[PDB]
Amino acid sequence: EILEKLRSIVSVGDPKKKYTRFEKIGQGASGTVYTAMDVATGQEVAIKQMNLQQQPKKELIINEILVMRENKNPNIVNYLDSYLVGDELWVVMEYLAGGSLTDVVTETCMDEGQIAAVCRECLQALEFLHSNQVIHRNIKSDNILLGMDGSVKLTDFGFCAQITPEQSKRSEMVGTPYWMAPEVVTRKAYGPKVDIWSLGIMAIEMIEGEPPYLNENPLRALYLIATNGTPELQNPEKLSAIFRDFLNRCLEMDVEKRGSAKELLQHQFLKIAKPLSSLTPLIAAAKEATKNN
Numbered sequence: 066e067i068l069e070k071l072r073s074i075v076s077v078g079d080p081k082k083k084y085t086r087f088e089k090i091g092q093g094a095s096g097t098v099y100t101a102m103d104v105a106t107g108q109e110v111a112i113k114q115m116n117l118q119q120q121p122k123k124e125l126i127i128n129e130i131l132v133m134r135e136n137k138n139p140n141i142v143n144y145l146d147s148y149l150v151g152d153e154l155w156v157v158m159e160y161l162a163g164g165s166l167t168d169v170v171t172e173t174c175m176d177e178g179q180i181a182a183v184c185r186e187c188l189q190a191l192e193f194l195h196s197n198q199v200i201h202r203n204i205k206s207d208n209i210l211l212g213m214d215g216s217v218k219l220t221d222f223g224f225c226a227q228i229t230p231e232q233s234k235r236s237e238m239v240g241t242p243y244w245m246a247p248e249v250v251t252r253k254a255y256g257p258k259v260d261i262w263s264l265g266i267m268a269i270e271m272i273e274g275e276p277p278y279l280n281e282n283p284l285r286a287l288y289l290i291a292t293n294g295t296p297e298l299q300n301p302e303k304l305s306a307i308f309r310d311f312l313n314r315c316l317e318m319d320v321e322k323r324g325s326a327k328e329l330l331q332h333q334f335l336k337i338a339k340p341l342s343s344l345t346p347l348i349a350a351a352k353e354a355t356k357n358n
């Protein structure tokens with residue numbers, strides 16, 4: 066009964082009377098996400114509703130709230146408040162008009178300057194997290210929110226881990242299979258660089274529309290990742306050399322030679338980054354492609 070700690074993180078108050086105009090904007094294993102309007106202040110918010118009985122390891126919910134409230138940053142979605150209502154936890158965040166990077170990678174073609182800009186913002190987030198001793202462990206396009214202002218933010222801290230000088234490596238087989246690093250899949254001690262791998266896979270998503278092996282089942286993908294290591298592109302000759310080089314540093318098998326986020330922020334590939342405004346057309350196009358979907 067560590068549900069003691071959770072009940073005292075949470076604010077008290079009528080959540081269904083503090084906020085109105087609930088429209089579902091998203092869903093996940095994590096839960097359903099709604100937009101809503103604060104009765105007071107008028108401010109529109111994003112609220113995630115998470116069934117508790119679905120999550121057996123309730124330290125992960127606690128850990129999730131704490132990591133968001135203690136590691137605020139422009140490239141991380143902004144925690145406002147939390148509330149327990151019945152057998153359901155509500156997490157309130159700042160709403161940003163925009164979309165997931167998943168809508169853009171599946172519905173559009175990004176150029177290298179657009180890709181370089183997303184990567185840079187993501188690496189900025191990870192360098193911040195990694196220096197504050199936090200591994201995300203679930204990097205993927207579905208967990209990147211793009212703002213109509215041009216913003217790029219990380220979300221979904223439900224799988225994240227805190228490390229220490231003493232316990233500097235983790236050992237949980239955690240993540241989404243197609244984005245998981247080999248050292249995770251093969252049950253070795255792993256550190257912050259598993260996020261770098263995952264970002265590399267997200268770069269493939271932006272190039273090819275999908276992570277490697279997506280047409281395979283999750284379990285098979287796991288086998289493939291462990292046996293193949295560094296995945297191959299469908300059409301590698303389509304990319305510039307600096308881009309290819311960035312990918313090779315992200316998707317290095319040798320953890321020690323794989324880029325940290327600090328290193329990677331200095332790579333040449335990010336120097337072709339367009340301005341963030343260049344992303345808003347992508348967002349516009351994704352909304353149009355999913356008018357029905």
Ligand SMILES: N[C@H]1CC[C@@H](CNc2nccc(Nc3ncc(C(F)(F)F)s3)n2)CC1
Binds near residue numbers: 162165210220
């Ligand atoms: N998995 C990521 C976060 C959830 C999000 C739901 N879809 C969405 N669609 C339009 C706009 C929008 N704006 C948001 N602002 C803040 C938000 C969060 F809840 F994450 F804090 S979502 N979100 C999808 C991508």
